């Protein structure tokens, strides 16, 4: 099916040169596969999820919807039916951050352990944060990926090197950084050799959480992460079997490469592409 006009971010990864097309086209979308959102909630009732969004967790004892905005953000460039790559995932909200978007770590890892222990496969995790390097973050994270979760992770707005911030250091998740719409790093996108690849994350438009039609626009390697996460469930859709390490492996060979400039020593270079 092709989209069009389509958020420009959709836009960018379904080609491998500019200029942008003002069209996403999609061969699946994500049916059957389970996203797990871990951030500040959903608005499970945002009209951009058709019913699709329900909460699986609250690490903070209240009902898993969103009172920040990130969250739906995010869960719409993952699978809202115009601003998402995955137009029929299954959402989960998995609040683990408070309307102010602050959390302690001892809370994010609980939502990463129900992910562990709850989820369903085909099953991809979202993690649109990040912080100092701790490593009881990072084994939680990757006992979730040997457990058969695929995690899409933000690389961090640092302008530093991500390998040393949690959980965007982890080898074993995709590590995302962000680029603009003229295919350069943005300017405060962590980069080096722990980044995967980079994805869309300037100028993001997607749902937001103050009325059940509200949008807004934000910047950010938490806006490129969902890009990856959406991808990662397209696959997953038509490779219902496969393993993290081979959905990974999918996304970064398929990648469009050499078309970005600006991105660091150390950095891939390597931009989300769809169609794989
Ligand atoms: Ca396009
Ligand atoms: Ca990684």
Redesign the pocket.
Known sequence: ATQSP?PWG??????RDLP??????YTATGRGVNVYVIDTGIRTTHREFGGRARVGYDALGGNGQDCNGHGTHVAGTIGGVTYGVAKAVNLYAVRVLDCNGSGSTSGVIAGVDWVTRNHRRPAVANMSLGGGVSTALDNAVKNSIAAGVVYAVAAGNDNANACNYSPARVAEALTVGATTSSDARASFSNYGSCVDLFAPGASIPSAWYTSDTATQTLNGTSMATPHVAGVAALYLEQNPSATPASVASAILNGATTGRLSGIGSGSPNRLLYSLL
């Not at 959709?10 to 080609?15: N, T, V």
């Not at 942008?20 to 086209?25: Q, R």
Request: no cysteine; proline share 0%.
């Open positions: 389509a959709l836009d960018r990864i379904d080609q942008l097309s003002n069209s996403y086209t």
